[PDB]
Symmetry: D2
């Protein structure tokens, strides 16, 4: 595996899947740079824990819907890190709106964060990945299945597959690998609600996913054990539907 000493950027790592991937990479000895949109309890506790671990980690506010802020985020990634080994496009948004009522600004918001943001993050990171780098984008199985009231979400998550596939062709001989992780249903802040079975019935394993299991796949794509894996969609979904 050999992750110790690498430098990784993980967008949207203050909550859920991003927070699990960030903390798991850090405990493995990866220098993890992460970002978030707004100062909240989650990012404050995230910085607190990142400091409690031994490593060169950073957590900065950056709204990926604003290309200016992506440029500033990568200014200080190159300032503090200088290089990157792993980029993990994980930041994303979602909303449940009937399609006929979906406002143009909410369509544009989901496109700007989930798709244009991941693209700009990748584009800025290409110079800093160098001779060798692994780019991982978080997709979802739902874009193959289709879910009502979230056509704008599945549109963006499926676009990441088309983006990754062409990028893998373009930069393969440069030593850069691009892949997508197709996620099932991962338990995140369902703990904030009160009474899961609806989705567990759809899985083959009979349980929802955990952010650390996504981290297990991210760690493999970060590792040289996957050095011949590029342009692929890796399903980490428990065989759902």
């Amino acid at each position: 595996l050999g992750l110790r000493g690498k430098k990784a950027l993980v967008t949207g790592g203050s909550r859920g899947v991003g927070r699990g991937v960030v903390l798991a990479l850090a405990r493995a000895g990866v220098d993890v740079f992460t970002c978030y949109r707004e100062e909240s309890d989650a990012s404050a506790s995230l910085a607190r824990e990142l400091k409690q671990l031994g490593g060169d980690h950073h957590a900065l506010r950056a709204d990926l819907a604003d290309p200016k802020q992506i440029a500033e985020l990568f200014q200080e990634v190159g300032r503090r890190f200088g290089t990157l080994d792993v980029v993990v496009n994980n930041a994303g948004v979602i909303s449940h709106v009937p399609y006929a009522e979906l406002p143009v600004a909410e369509w544009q918001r989901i496109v700007d964060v989930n798709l244009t943001g991941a693209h700009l993050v990748i584009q800025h990171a290409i110079p800093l990945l160098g001779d060798k780098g692994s780019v991982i984008s978080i997709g979802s199985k739902s874009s193959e299945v289709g879910i009502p009231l979230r056509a704008h979400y599945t549109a963006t998550k499926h676009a990441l597959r088309g983006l990754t596939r062409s990028l893998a062709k373009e930069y393969g001989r440069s030593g850069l690998r691009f892949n997508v992780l197709a996620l099932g249903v991962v338990e995140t802040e369902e703990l904030h609600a009160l009474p899961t079975k609806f989705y567990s019935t759809k899985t083959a394993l009979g349980r929802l996913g955990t952010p650390d299991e996504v981290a297990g796949a991210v760690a493999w794509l970060a590792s040289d054990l996957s050095r011949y894996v590029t342009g692929a969609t890796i399903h980490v979904d428990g065989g759902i539907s």
Copy 2:
């Protein structure tokens, strides 16, 4: 058979290429065809004439699909001239060959605004006009599965059309609306580079696209929704 005669269709980007073939083939079959283009050209003037000469209630207006209010205007005129729609064909799209590291954000936005947001807005405006029964066809690409250097922004948008279509299929299926994607292949030291990749050894023609479009517009495909139909000659 297909039973297309009399139905009403909107085909975006019908002045040239694949769109012009679909528009002209649907018109000759007795379909009232409403099409649009981005800029007044010899192709759009030639198109407007050939349409005006057929026994048909055909229309061709200018509408830049990267401008949401030109799309809203386009559908005000479709609603006045047609009142209703049976089939919509998201064909308008753009492509450019740019080294990814050199791709400016504006050219990225242009491909997204036309290929992705445009198709979404056209669909969103057309749903009221389709009523209780309709068939929405979006033009995709086999290249979004293969990957093509210098065109990651293009394959991003064309693959987005599949994720959109799959969710719209499930949202509007019980309302009588069907949503599908046509994955197209390549439509002489260039013809044969692509012919060698095909199973049939030849490039496609717009009228063969019209053959699939016609099937998806008919009740013969009434149980087909949320699908990606490959019209690519088995390429790659």
Copy 3:
């Protein structure tokens, strides 16, 4: 020019006495296609089929032939050669299924599902290729379920998925010879209360399929309107899960 142009063609449809095959056979026949069909055992289904084909005047033939036996596939095609001489359309529709727990699946039941669904489909195609000549459309009946997975039926989905891998190489091999090969991925189709609503909830259209809806797709693939379609998996499944 936007017409199917099926009148006068010659078609072979395997397993045409019940279910999807019977619907495809009768729909092609009513459209003026001379239909050759087969079945495994003399029943009233086959007797009803022959009586109705006689009532729809045309050069139709319905013979007994067990596709699990390569000797009877060979003779079926001697009869096809005698009576038709040529073929325009082939529909690999015949297939068997059983619900057996995978650990208790006997070798003979596995082998019979393989013999009929896969080896039989392959022998039908191998025998039919000479009869198709310069131009022909081969259609194999697949299933959407082989992408989803169904417990107690891993042998069924194994064979129905194998038809896709066979079809795709066959399209590459014979494309320049004027032969097209495709698969119809079927959803749940009404044939021979709780199950109807159980599967209808999984569709996008909220209803199960009809054999005539399959025939609508077969009709397209048999037509010149699909002359550039080959090596494809066409889904006729109502958007099922």
Copy 4:
């Protein structure tokens, strides 16, 4: 984040040559007790047994023609008798041939079906009682089964069948602690290296590297990297999936 592979017990079919030999040796060097099989006594099988002996611990290599259900029963008598338990199964044994489809004799179709599809099915069916409440079943597939290749339709039919088998088995046994996945391989250099050279000096290598994104063929050890992950608890939520280890070939 660790592969906890030391001490596990694996069965890798067809381990004397090529990809399976790379997977056997890589797993054995990692502290996995590896059971493997082969069809005929060759110098490849003897070389494998000797190199396994230079390692530890107890690896086993036994002849078993998987076109014969009786010899698969023999193989699993010896596995349950020397191991008693399995943690990983890799369906790697496979055959291929170039026959013009119109010339393809029925016995050659049946041979490819017997080894690539029925053989793997019997191996999985015999291995389930030994995998218990936790196990990982990996089947070696091919990217070529979705691109299509002339003169090999019988091969791509069987390699694509493995995906349909795997997906339904994942649904059926997922709640029992068993996971099932496919590794779709690209062009992996094996002893391609003997049908040298000009035929091989860049005719084969260059034609296939042009199709890849990385511009190079795969090695058995890179396949072993994927087999390692799927055998590990880092992939405990990965089941019913087709993992592409193909260098982006298309």
